[PDB]
Amino acid sequence: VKRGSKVRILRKESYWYQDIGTVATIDTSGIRYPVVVRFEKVSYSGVNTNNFSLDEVVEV
Amino acid sequence: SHSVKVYDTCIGCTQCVRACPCDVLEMVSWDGCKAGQIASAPRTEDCIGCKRCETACPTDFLSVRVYLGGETTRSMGLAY
Amino acid sequence: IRHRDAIISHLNWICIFLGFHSFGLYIHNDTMRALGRTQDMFSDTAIQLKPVFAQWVQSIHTLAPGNTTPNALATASYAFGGDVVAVGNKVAMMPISLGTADFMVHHI
Amino acid sequence: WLRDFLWAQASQVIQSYGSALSAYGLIFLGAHFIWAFSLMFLFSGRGYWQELIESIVWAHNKLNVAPAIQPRALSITQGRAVGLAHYLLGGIGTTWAFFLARIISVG
Amino acid sequence: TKFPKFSQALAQDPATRRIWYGLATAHDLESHDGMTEENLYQKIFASHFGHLAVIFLWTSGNLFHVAWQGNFEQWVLNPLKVKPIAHAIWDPHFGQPAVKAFTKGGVSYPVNIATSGVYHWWYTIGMRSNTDLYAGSLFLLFLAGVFLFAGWLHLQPKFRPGLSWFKNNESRLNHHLSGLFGFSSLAWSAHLIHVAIPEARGQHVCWDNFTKVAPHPAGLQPFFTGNWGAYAASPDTTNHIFGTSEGAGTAILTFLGGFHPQTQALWLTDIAHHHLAIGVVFIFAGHMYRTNWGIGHSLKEILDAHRPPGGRLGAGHKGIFETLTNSLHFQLGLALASLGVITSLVAQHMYALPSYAFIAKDYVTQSALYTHHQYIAGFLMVGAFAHGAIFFVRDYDPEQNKNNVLARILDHKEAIISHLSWVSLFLGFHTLGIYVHNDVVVAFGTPEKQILVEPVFAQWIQASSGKALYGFDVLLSSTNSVAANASSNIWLPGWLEAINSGKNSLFLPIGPGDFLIHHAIALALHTTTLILVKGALDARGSKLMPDKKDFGYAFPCDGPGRGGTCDISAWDAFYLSMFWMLNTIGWVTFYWHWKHITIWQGNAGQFNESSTYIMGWLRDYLWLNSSPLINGYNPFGMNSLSVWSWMFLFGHLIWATGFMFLISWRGYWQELIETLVWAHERTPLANLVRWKDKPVALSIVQARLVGLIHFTAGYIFTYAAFVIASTTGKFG
Amino acid sequence: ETLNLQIPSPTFEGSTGGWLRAAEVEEKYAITWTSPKEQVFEMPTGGAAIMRQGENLLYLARKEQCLALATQVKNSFKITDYKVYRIFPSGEVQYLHPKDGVFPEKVNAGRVGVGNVSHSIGKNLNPAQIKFTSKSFNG
Amino acid sequence: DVAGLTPCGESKEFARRLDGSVKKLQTRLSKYEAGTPPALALQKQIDKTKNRFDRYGKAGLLCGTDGLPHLITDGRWTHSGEFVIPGLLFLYVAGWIGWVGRSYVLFARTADKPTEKEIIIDVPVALSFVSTGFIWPFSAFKEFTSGNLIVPADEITVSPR
Numbered sequence A: 001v002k003r004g005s006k007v008r009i010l011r012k013e014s015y016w017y018q019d020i021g022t023v024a025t026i027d028t029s030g031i032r033y034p035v036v037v038r039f040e041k042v043s044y045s046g047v048n049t050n051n052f053s054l055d056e057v058v059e060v
Numbered sequence B: 001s002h003s004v005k006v007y008d009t010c011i012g013c014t015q016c017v018r019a020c021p022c023d024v025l026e027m028v029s030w031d032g033c034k035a036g037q038i039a040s041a042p043r044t045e046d047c048i049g050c051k052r053c054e055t056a057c058p059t060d061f062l063s064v065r066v067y068l069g070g071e072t073t074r075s076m077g078l079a080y
Numbered sequence C: 001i002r003h004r005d006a007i008i009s010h011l012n013w014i015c016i017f018l019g020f021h022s023f024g025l026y027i028h029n030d031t032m033r034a035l036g037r038t039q040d041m042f043s044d045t046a047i048q049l050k051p052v053f054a055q056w057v058q059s060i061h062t063l064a065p066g067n068t069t070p071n072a073l074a075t076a077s078y079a080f081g082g083d084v085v086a087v088g089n090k091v092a093m094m095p096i097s098l099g100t101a102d103f104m105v106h107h108i
Numbered sequence D: 001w002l003r004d005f006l007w008a009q010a011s012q013v014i015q016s017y018g019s020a021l022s023a024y025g026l027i028f029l030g031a032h033f034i035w036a037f038s039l040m041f042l043f044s045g046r047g048y049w050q051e052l053i054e055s056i057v058w059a060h061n062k063l064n065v066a067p068a069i070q071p072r073a074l075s076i077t078q079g080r081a082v083g084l085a086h087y088l089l090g091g092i093g094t095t096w097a098f099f100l101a102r103i104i105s106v107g
Numbered sequence E: 001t002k003f004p005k006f007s008q009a010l011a012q013d014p015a016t017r018r019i020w021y022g023l024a025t026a027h028d029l030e031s032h033d034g035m036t037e038e039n040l041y042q043k044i045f046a047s048h049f050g051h052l053a054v055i056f057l058w059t060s061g062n063l064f065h066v067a068w069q070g071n072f073e074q075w076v077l078n079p080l081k082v083k084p085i086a087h088a089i090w091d092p093h094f095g096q097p098a099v100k101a102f103t104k105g106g107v108s109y110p111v112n113i114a115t116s117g118v119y120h121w122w123y124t125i126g127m128r129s130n131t132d133l134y135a136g137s138l139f140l141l142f143l144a145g146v147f148l149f150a151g152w153l154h155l156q157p158k159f160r161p162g163l164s165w166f167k168n169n170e171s172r173l174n175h176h177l178s179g180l181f182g183f184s185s186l187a188w189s190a191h192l193i194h195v196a197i198p199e200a201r202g203q204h205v206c207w208d209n210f211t212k213v214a215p216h217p218a219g220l221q222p223f224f225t226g227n228w229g230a231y232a233a234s235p236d237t238t239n240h241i242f243g244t245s246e247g248a249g250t251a252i253l254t255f256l257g258g259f260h261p262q263t264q265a266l267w268l269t270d271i272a273h274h275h276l277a278i279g280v281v282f283i284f285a286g287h288m289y290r291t292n293w294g295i296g297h298s299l300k301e302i303l304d305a306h307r308p309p310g311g312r313l314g315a316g317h318k319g320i321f322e323t324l325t326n327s328l329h330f331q332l333g334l335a336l337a338s339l340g341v342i343t344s345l346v347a348q349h350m351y352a353l354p355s356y357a358f359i360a361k362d363y364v365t366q367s368a369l370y371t372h373h374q375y376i377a378g379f380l381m382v383g384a385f386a387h388g389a390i391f392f393v394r395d396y397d398p399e400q401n402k403n404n405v406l407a408r409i410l411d412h413k414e415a416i417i418s419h420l421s422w423v424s425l426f427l428g429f430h431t432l433g434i435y436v437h438n439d440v441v442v443a444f445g446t447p448e449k450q451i452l453v454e455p456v457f458a459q460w461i462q463a464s465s466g467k468a469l470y471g472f473d474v475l476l477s478s479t480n481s482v483a484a485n486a487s488s489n490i491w492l493p494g495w496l497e498a499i500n501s502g503k504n505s506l507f508l509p510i511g512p513g514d515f516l517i518h519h520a521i522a523l524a525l526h527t528t529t530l531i532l533v534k535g536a537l538d539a540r541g542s543k544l545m546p547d548k549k550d551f552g553y554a555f556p557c558d559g560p561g562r563g564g565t566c567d568i569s570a571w572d573a574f575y576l577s578m579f580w581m582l583n584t585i586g587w588v589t590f591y592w593h594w595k596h597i598t599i600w601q602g603n604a605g606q607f608n609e610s611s612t613y614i615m616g617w618l619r620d621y622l623w624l625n626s627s628p629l630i631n632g633y634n635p636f637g638m639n640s641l642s643v644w645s646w647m648f649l650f651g652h653l654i655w656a657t658g659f660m661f662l663i664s665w666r667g668y669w670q671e672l673i674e675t676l677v678w679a680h681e682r683t684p685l686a687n688l689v690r691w692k693d694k695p696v697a698l699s700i701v702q703a704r705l706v707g708l709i710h711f712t713a714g715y716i717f718t719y720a721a722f723v724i725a726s727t728t729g730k731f732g
Numbered sequence F: 001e002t003l004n005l006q007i008p009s010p011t012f013e014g015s016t017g018g019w020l021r022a023a024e025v026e027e028k029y030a031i032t033w034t035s036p037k038e039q040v041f042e043m044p045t046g047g048a049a050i051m052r053q054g055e056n057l058l059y060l061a062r063k064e065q066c067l068a069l070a071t072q073v074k075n076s077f078k079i080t081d082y083k084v085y086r087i088f089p090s091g092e093v094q095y096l097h098p099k100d101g102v103f104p105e106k107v108n109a110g111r112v113g114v115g116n117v118s119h120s121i122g123k124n125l126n127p128a129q130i131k132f133t134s135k136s137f138n139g
Numbered sequence G: 001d002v003a004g005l006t007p008c009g010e011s012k013e014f015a016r017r018l019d020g021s022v023k024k025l026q027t028r029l030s031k032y033e034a035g036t037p038p039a040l041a042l043q044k045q046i047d048k049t050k051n052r053f054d055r056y057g058k059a060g061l062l063c064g065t066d067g068l069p070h071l072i073t074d075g076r077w078t079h080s081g082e083f084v085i086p087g088l089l090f091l092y093v094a095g096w097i098g099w100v101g102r103s104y105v106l107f108a109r110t111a112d113k114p115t116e117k118e119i120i121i122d123v124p125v126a127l128s129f130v131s132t133g134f135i136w137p138f139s140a141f142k143e144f145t146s147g148n149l150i151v152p153a154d155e156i157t158v159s160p161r
């Protein structure tokens, strides 16, 4: 993906699994979960952002 | 004792380690997150099972997971 | 705060004693009346738990007019003893006698 | 106490229908309801109710009518506060109707 | 330090929690340390023999105590006037008034009157004296021992079956259908034809004379000729006096329909022909599956082939065969759901079609039996869903079940759970709404503004069976119908007599009060199903705990984070549905009992008018029928309803004590216990005594279980005291 | 390193909230810290005590009680000089916290990670897969 | 009649209901003088009670043995005014409320602060939506067939299982 794009989450235990977020940053370093995605819904913990990997994220 | 696990989704925020009332958790060096550090559970015999670490954790599903197990004098928090 | 264990353990013991020796008297009576043993009950007719201290205080307050409250003409309340006050053929107030049932429910 | 006080003196509030005291008869039943309904909040826990809400949220998502103020089960404390409030409203309201219909009829 | 020998995690707990948890986990053999699958099935096998012996010991004791202390022989002479005796009382706490008050039954000693109906069952099946009641007790004592020895024997090294034996689905099904169900139904047909029916006709038949006394005068010659209808000839006359030769026929196999006119029970020849026919059908069924001779079905082949080609069920039942065989919880759930439905059929068909002579004139026995079996039904139905939840958490593998019916259930679980949520709310809003409307409208002096819906659908079903009460004139009620003409030569004449007399409980007349309560019962069935289905379908995971399956079936919570997670486990939905199961069986048994006590008085119009609002249920059912029960003792004496009067209060006490475990939770109690631990150590002469196990407050899950047990026990004892004493006190 | 048993204790008038027989027969915990002042603090077990200027020493029954005091002593008195010990009735004194001289929330070399699982939490094994098998659910 | 019921106009038990309801009011009226406010209040209640009983008798309602009206709800057209038409009236209002509420939640999603529109309702826009509800059956079905009522299963968050 690229920064600022809209993505549909594919991590089955995510709060936002099959919901749309927007990509904040992507880390070039060897990070296991380099895609930073922000959402408009908060999770049950009140967090509105999470890190993801490329194989857990699809552009819409 | 209780079983406390740290999954590789840990962003190294150290919040679980600061919230732990029994010094169960500490930070060890890593290279899988930007912070360069991951939570660790070297002293789970002292874990009382409060799950204050899980409350502190900000990853979408908890990087730190407490699994309540056999009860002891330490994990039952008995001063008697 | 520095002896709250001694306070809470002593109150806890009083509440167990009180529950056993107030509500357990009722349970004793339920069982005895159910078992056909009315002579074994805590009752005015059978074993009597009289409230002598409350009855005695009631005695004093009826004796108070002219004795320990000399210029009073009547008692503070007819609940302590004395006459029946009737208004429109309905009782206004009249002595509220205390017996075993009154002993039991006061300890309740 | 069960027979000669509660049963004997509940006669007025139960037989009050069709009279001016039928309001007490209705509040007797209504408060019995509120009291029992309170036990839903007192004996239950928040984790059941959030997971039940999830399926209800799903059916709204299916019809595109989910709210933007995301529904939550009440807090653990608020479940205790709601349970206690309806218990008190129900318990006291039952006695209020029972006391008032009884003593208006006979006293 | 060694009581939970099956659990090292509990045997190393230093608290009093070890004693509690070791007792509560004792029968969950799958969780015990070092449990293989071989040993799991072998311990279950032996403990099934041990359970069987307990059932035979329980039955022998009921037979023995009636033979010894009962009035069975006196009751048999005059069964509508004598009250059956269960067992005698020896209680040294009794006063002399209590001893006199319980000396009923025609005997010289305190006794408990029986509400179980065993007198009517043993009379109907043949028992006539105390000596064959005791002979039956001796046989069950022998059978209990034979099954105790069999349990021990199949735990011996050479007699321990292999897992290949325990999972032979086709051989077990063949034998249980054709032998356990079918042949014993045939053998029970033999008992009725050879013993019960002859002794209903005055002729004693026992082991002494059975081989020289023919059940039929013709005698096993019409059977071997195809002249089978010669066994229906000369049925019992309507003048027959049960137990005697007067009015008796010679038939042994009839389809008369209806009731014996004097016993008000089904004909014994209908019952024998029922069991012969059912037995033949079941034996044929027990030849379905392939075992060793090349004919029959593979169960695996049938399940794999039932995938509808339209694809609406996905892969269908591929892989269900392995899923059911390997999961004992899946097997238990199917068994309990099936058993739960049957014990509800037993309750419904035994009050409307009674089989025992002179029962249904025993209003106490008829009421207790219905109440007993619906409560058993509700427990069995909860357990099936609980063990379905235990299956998904523990035994369900999503990769061996790719696109099954099972996996596709979990794929639309929110569709299922939200539609139960809608139908529960739909029923609840309007069923409660009409009742509240009716109460308010009746309270204001205007009962004619009530919303009274006629239950026409059920009345039309009654009329379809021949009920001539609503003028519907459909099917069996219609005189000239293909349905009515077809059954006319067999059961129609007897059935129409039975269903159009208003003197029994076959298809009881119904109105608006019955309409309203059935929709309340519908509300409670869908709401109990909702909690249990939500517990089963969210057991593996949810959005709060997506990894809920890693924690088990019964765990307290996941802590106060993520908003709070109290009662989040699948076990906790069993816990919550138990309250709804108790509520529903209450609504069912309150309805059954009020509808029956008003009919038994001759005042069915009291139910008809008062059941449409909730104050009618409160004053005309609970308050009105309470008075014989709560007067079992008073300051003016006591009578034999004093024990139920005490059980009534006892039940209110246990029920309310359960609230303490359900409302107040652990943190309050652990902090008190710490002040009690301090005081013991500081009190002289008392600190000489020390606990071996540190006293701790009950666990979070345990308190839920303790409160649920107290709630449930209080519920049962209160209603049983009420349903028995109010019926006894009224006799109507 | 070892606990100097002679360190003076904060002025306290006693309470019923202190340790019981399990401390003298199973284990006891101690905390030491340096105070720049002679100031009042709150005991985890009860009322208020006064820490003496210099080195203080307490004995508590639970490890959490020593750390709850450590949290308070560092948040209101900015004492970061606290060392927590475990004491067995055999006389053995076991240093506990901070375990390697550096606080746990700060990284340190030579710390080996315990409890770390290479996958995310959703990648665990289903219970049915590991039934009658010793294999662990974390992959 | 239907299900062995009797039309309320010829039910004798309905007739005794009306009489007993009026005797109960007339004995309360026997304790008041003619022009008093309690006499006029009770005389108006006797008029209302009689009117209600007259209307029910002439309406085609069926009475039971208890003399109370019973409702037939099986679908027959001679009795459609007891459930089917009140039900048709209900569902029109209920779908209106549902369509109007749904239209506003979709509007509020496209707002600057979507959750502020739900605790502080834009009353001119919310009144624009309430007026639109009169043709909800046509508006909602066209919404359905145009693929705007139902969202596909793969844009809905579900639990992992």
Ligand code: CLA
Pocket (backbone or CB within 6 Å): C012, C013, C015, C016, C017, C018, C019, C020, C023, C024, C027, E653, E656, E657, E658, E659, E660, E663, E664, E668
């Ligand atoms: C009927 C219901 C009921 C009953 C019996 C109790 C009983 C009790 N509660 Mg609980 N409680 C209840 C409902 C009830 N509660 C509810 C609904 C709540 C919800 C908020 C609470 C919340 C609550 C709190 C928060 C506290 C209590 C406390 C107490 C205790 C009071 C002390 C006492 O009386 O000891 C005497 C015991 C009794 C009266 C129990 C009945 C015993 C009778 C006399 C018969 C005994 C028979 C005998 C043992 C038979 C032995 C043989 C047999 C084993 C075969 C006692 C254990 C307090 C406590 O524990 O402090 C002391 C306390 O702090 N309760």
Ligand code: CLA
Pocket (backbone or CB within 6 Å): E044, E045, E048, E049, E052, E165, E166, E168, E171, E172, E175, E176, E178, E179, E180, E181, E342
């Ligand atoms: C014909 C041969 C035969 C027979 C008679 C049985 C009989 C039995 N087997 Mg089986 N079994 C067989 C062959 C057979 N087995 C074979 C070949 C295998 C190997 C493939 C097995 C493997 C096997 C296992 C592994 C187990 C059994 C078990 C059982 C017992 C079941 C529990 C019970 O009592 O239910 C009795 C059931 C009935 C009488 C019928 C059900 C009745 C239904 C529910 C309704 C009836 C309503 C009716 C009106 C009743 C009225 C009652 C009255 C009061 C009015 C039962 C005694 C279990 C057991 O308990 O072990 C001891 C068990 O664990 N069997």
Ligand code: CLA
Pocket (backbone or CB within 6 Å): D033, D036, D037, D038, D039, D040, D041, D043, D044, D052, E421, E422, E424, E425, E426, E427, E428, E429, E432, E527, E530, E531, E576, E577, E579, E580
């Ligand atoms: C009288 C007691 C009572 C009542 C009424 C309810 C009612 C309900 N329960 Mg609860 N419950 C209770 C006791 C009770 N429960 C107890 C003791 C337990 C054991 C802990 C439970 C456990 C339980 C669980 C676990 C579940 C339920 C569910 C339900 C719902 C099932 C019926 C339904 O769906 O529609 C009936 C709807 C109603 C009765 C609502 C009444 C309509 C109201 C009163 C409108 C009035 C508005 C009025 C103006 C308000 C005035 C306020 C004033 C301040 C102005 C419903 C909300 C299930 C659920 O929520 O599924 C959807 C569910 O999953 N209950």
Ligand code: CLA
Pocket (backbone or CB within 6 Å): E423, E426, E427, E453, E454, E455, E456, E457, E458, E459, E510, E514, E515, E516, E518, E519, E522, G073, G074, G083, G084, G085, G086, G087, G088, G091
């Ligand atoms: C989901 C709702 C629901 C449920 C679970 C039940 C359940 C039951 N009903 Mg009830 N019933 C319902 C709705 C429901 N009913 C409604 C809405 C009506 C119309 C007033 C009736 C009228 C009715 C009668 C007359 C009788 C029953 C009876 C019964 C029982 C036997 C089965 C039966 O006849 O099904 C009935 C099933 C249906 C009518 C199907 C309803 C399904 C839809 C989705 C419900 C909503 C329809 C909608 C509101 C109307 C459309 C608009 C229309 C006005 C134009 C059982 C307790 C019988 C019984 O045994 O009573 C003692 C009986 O005689 N019911």
Ligand code: CLA
Pocket (backbone or CB within 6 Å): D055, D056, D057, D059, D060, D063, D065, E418, E419, E421, E422, E425, G097, G098, G099, G100, G101, G102, G104, G121, G126, G127, G129, G130
């Ligand atoms: C108008 C908005 C709206 C719409 C279209 C829906 C639509 C639906 N809801 Mg409801 N719901 C709403 C509001 C709404 N909901 C609110 C405010 C609540 C909180 C009480 C709920 C609570 C709720 C539950 C608990 C359930 C549903 C269910 C459902 C579904 C079936 C219909 C039903 O059971 O109604 C039931 C409706 C209620 C119980 C409450 C409705 C209360 C009022 C009347 C609606 C709100 C009016 C709102 C203020 C509109 C203002 C508009 C204005 C600003 C222009 C359907 C998806 C059920 C489901 O999932 O089944 C598939 C279900 O179980 N909903």
Ligand SMILES: CCCCCCCCCCCCCCCC(=O)OC[C@H](COP(=O)(O)OC[C@@H](O)CO)OC(=O)CCCCCCCCCCCCCCC
Pocket (backbone or CB within 6 Å): E308, E309, E310, E311, E312
């Ligand atoms: C006691 C057991 C209770 C079990 C309940 C279980 C829950 C419910 C189970 C699902 C059943 C309902 C869903 C399947 C419902 C169902 O029946 O499925 C039928 C069928 C799906 O079944 P199959 O997949 O086996 O059919 C294969 C076809 O799709 C291609 O071959 O749908 C069709 O594609 C064919 C349409 C029917 C063929 C025409 C039939 C006649 C139509 C006209 C009739 C006369 C009309 C005019 C006069 C009025």
Ligand SMILES: CC1=CCCC(C)(C)[C@H]1/C=C/C(C)=C/C=C/C(C)=C/C=C/C=C(C)/C=C/C=C(C)/C=C/C1=C(C)CCCC1(C)C
Pocket (backbone or CB within 6 Å): E047, E049, E050, E051, E053, E054, E057
């Ligand atoms: C729950 C439970 C736990 C574990 C699993 C389990 C085993 C499957 C299950 C089973 C439990 C079961 C099945 C429990 C079964 C328990 C039973 C059947 C207990 C029976 C006791 C009988 C006694 C003590 C009678 C003794 C008579 C005597 C001594 C008379 C003697 C004599 C007299 C006077 C006259 C004759 C001469 C003499 C000899 C002198």
Ligand SMILES: CC1=CCCC(C)(C)[C@H]1/C=C/C(C)=C/C=C/C(C)=C/C=C/C=C(C)/C=C/C=C(C)/C=C/C1=C(C)CCCC1(C)C
Pocket (backbone or CB within 6 Å): E329, E330, E333, E334, E337, E338, E341, E384, E385, E386, E387, E388, E389, E391, E533, E536
């Ligand atoms: C939770 C859980 C998780 C997964 C595993 C699990 C254990 C499987 C599961 C549990 C599931 C459970 C507990 C499931 C429980 C399931 C139950 C209780 C199902 C009840 C079924 C009854 C039926 C189909 C009656 C049919 C009657 C008919 C057709 C009568 C017809 C008629 C005749 C013949 C005569 C009259 C006329 C008419 C009316 C025409």
Ligand SMILES: CC1=C(C/C=C(\C)CCC[C@H](C)CCC[C@H](C)CCCC(C)C)C(=O)c2ccccc2C1=O
Pocket (backbone or CB within 6 Å): D040, D041, D042, D044, D045, D046, D049, D050, D072, D073, D074, D075, D076, D078, D079, D080
């Ligand atoms: C039913 C229930 C819910 C679900 C109830 C919810 C989510 C609240 C539903 C309230 C509706 C949304 C509004 C309330 C309006 C009422 C009709 C009137 C209330 C009166 C005042 C609030 C105005 C919980 O969240 C819960 C949490 C913890 C323990 C027990 C329970 C519990 O029992």
Ligand code: SF4
Pocket (backbone or CB within 6 Å): B004, B019, B020, B021, B022, B023, B024, B025, B046, B047, B048, B049, B050, B051, B052, B053, B054, B066
């Ligand atoms: S459960 Fe409590 S004690 Fe255990 S690691 Fe988490 S925070 Fe620390």
Ligand code: SF4
Pocket (backbone or CB within 6 Å): B006, B009, B010, B011, B012, B013, B014, B015, B016, B017, B038, B039, B053, B056, B057, B058, B059, B062, B063, B064
């Ligand atoms: S709180 Fe969670 S994310 Fe932060 S360090 Fe601890 S485990 Fe990692």
